[PDB]
């Protein structure tokens, strides 16, 4: 199979800010990898993103009946669907499992990365802080960043550059909407 491929995507985007107080509908049409025409509820009519999409914006804008229904969709489409799935989406809360461990076994007084593993959580919004003997360490923090697992959970590894020495106590502290008080996990060098 050597045929060229041709792709068409349609994306109806309902954007919500501050609850459903502010809603924006953004209907986008994409040919191959390039958006060509869109309806933006803030604008009130179709606009050609590229010249290729101009005939469509013109053809559709001429039909004021369709535009009215698009202008109303912010209510009949977005706000309605928000309310449909709110309980299992906006309000989904899954508490993360938090573990701390050295990246690998290193010799005494050798450098190492202390890993704070934060997994299985939802939503994605999270804060992870490192403490050495009760004092926050902001330097030498490297992370994998926020990782979306595709199954409505996230994970992330936040690592602290350090030279673990006997007696030291390292704490990883996690703030997340699923809990009202921070999760803490200690690791003793």
């Amino acid at each position: 199979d050597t045929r060229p491929r041709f792709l068409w995507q349609l994306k109806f985007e309902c954007h919500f800010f501050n609850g459903t107080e502010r809603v924006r509908l953004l209907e986008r049409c994409i040919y191959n990898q390039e958006e060509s025409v869109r309806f933006d509820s803030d604008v009130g009519e179709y606009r050609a993103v590229t010249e290729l999409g101009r005939p469509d914006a013109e053809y559709w804008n001429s039909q004021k009946d369709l535009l009215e229904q698009r202008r109303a969709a912010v209510d009949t489409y977005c706000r309605h669907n928000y309310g449909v799935g709110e309980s299992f989406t906006v309000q989904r809360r899954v508490e993360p499992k938090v573990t701390v461990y050295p990246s690998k076994t290193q010799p005494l007084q050798h450098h190492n990365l202390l890993v704070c593993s934060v997994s299985g959580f939802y939503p994605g919004s999270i804060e992870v802080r490192w403490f050495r003997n009760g004092q926050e360490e902001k330097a030498g923090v490297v992370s994998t960043g926020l990782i979306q697992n595709g199954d409505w959970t996230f994970q992330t590894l936040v690592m602290l550059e350090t030279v673990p020495r006997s007696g030291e106590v390292y704490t990883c502290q996690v703030e997340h909407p699923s809990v009202t008080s921070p999760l803490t996990v200690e690791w003793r060098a």
């Binding site: 068409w8 109806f12 049409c29 977005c78 299992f88 697992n149």
Partner: protein, 178 residues
């Protein structure tokens, strides 16, 4: 901010269509075009909500028509193959002989067609596995997840083999216990 996206596509000449809802990047559901039914991503969703699948097929029929019109209007400018970035991870810290899941992340590619295979010690693993449909990206490329539950061992090696027109050859992404 939260974002709900109804994302649809049609691809020629494959005649592949897709209809899905996305919430902050996670699939709420898609409609099985062949069986004409609504497939919720997590079982619980279906208990709290519903959606008539028949509407999806009508939409996709419109998308197919628009595609052919657009294809001609662009003078048959074909899509540029963009090969996927592939990553294999566990969904939790790996404990020897402790149930876990391998995730093959297939990301930043187009068109939305790929062949994916899990390999254990070089042998295809075709049971226990699962996958998602194609998920939308803001740059209008696609994401996809494949899953393989397993039991960590010092004896097993794993690969996710991915094939895509953007690639000169099959891509193997390796995972094994230290």
């Amino acid at each position: 901010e939260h974002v709900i996206i109804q994302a649809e596509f049609y691809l020629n000449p494959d005649q592949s269509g897709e209809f899905m809802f996305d919430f902050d990047g996670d699939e709420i559901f898609h409609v099985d075009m062949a069986k004409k039914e609504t497939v919720w991503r997590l079982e619980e969703f279906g208990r709290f909500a519903s959606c008539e699948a028949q509407g999806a097929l009508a939409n996709i029929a419109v998308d197919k028509a628009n595609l052919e019109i657009m294809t001609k209007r662009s003078n048959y400018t074909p899509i540029t193959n963009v090969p996927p970035e592939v990553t294999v991870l566990t969904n939790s810290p790996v404990e020897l002989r402790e149930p876990n899941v391998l995730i093959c992340f297939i990301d930043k590619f187009t068109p939305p067609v790929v062949n994916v295979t899990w390999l254990r010690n070089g042998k295809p693993v075709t049971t226990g596995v699962s996958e998602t449909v194609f998920l939308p990206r803001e740059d209008h490329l696609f994401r996809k997840f494949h899953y393989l539950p397993f039991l960590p061992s010092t004896e097993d090696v794993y690969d996710c083999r991915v094939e895509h027109w953007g690639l000169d050859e099959p891509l193997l992404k390796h995972w094994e216990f230290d």
